[PDB]
């Protein structure tokens, strides 16, 4: 009853490990992921401001070809 338990129970220890280590290794990616979650939000900031910027560009674009005909 003990010889197997003096074999099986100690073996149970390190058969947690590598897969569980892989879990802490896989969640090391999560260490970035629960941290790099906000990268979209900061990305979501410029997607409009540049869109707001290119609107001025678009607004300035009219300033470009329109002066062509008027000066002509």
């Amino acid at each position, epitope marked *: 009853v003990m010889e197997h338990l003096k074999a099986i129970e100690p073996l149970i220890a390190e058969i947690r490990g590598p897969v569980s280590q892989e879990f802490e290794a896989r969640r*090391a990616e999560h*260490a970035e992921l629960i941290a790099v979650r906000a990268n979209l939000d900061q990305a979501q900031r410029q997607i409009a401001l540049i869109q707001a910027e290119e609107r001025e560009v678009s607004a300035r674009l009219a300033a470009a070809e329109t002066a062509l005909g008027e000066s002509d």
Partner: nanobody
Framework: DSLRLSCASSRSIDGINIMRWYRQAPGKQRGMVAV???????NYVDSVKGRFIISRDSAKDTVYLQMNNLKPEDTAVYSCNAIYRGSEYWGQGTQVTVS
């Protein structure tokens, strides 16, 4: 005598930070033996003074060494290591004979 070590590389060549070798003597944990860096400075662990020499390629990304002038403690399993972005990566790890 002469038996080399080759620690090859199939992905992500040399765009690496510091990389390392481990060995694990029987009934013990693992630890550094010899490392190189992006700066490629050569340093080791005292047990191999003048008895390990470490090197680096850009192309192959496969450190080499020397293993002789041998000691009965040299019977162990040798390995490698590398690390990125806050994550570490082991290697395979292989056996070694002193006789």
């Amino acid at each position: 005598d002469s038996l080399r070590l080759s620690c090859a590389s199939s992905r992500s060549i040399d765009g690496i930070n510091i990389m390392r070798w481990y060995r694990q003597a029987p009934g013990k944990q693992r630890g550094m033996v010899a490392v190189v860096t992006g700066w490629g400075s050569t340093n080791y662990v005292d047990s191999v003074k003048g008895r390990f020499i470490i090197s680096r390629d850009s192309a192959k990304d496969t450190v080499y060494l020397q293993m002789n002038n041998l000691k009965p403690e040299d019977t162990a399993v040798y390995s490698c290591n590398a690390i990125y972005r806050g994550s570490e990566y082991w290697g395979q790890g292989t056996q070694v004979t002193v006789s």
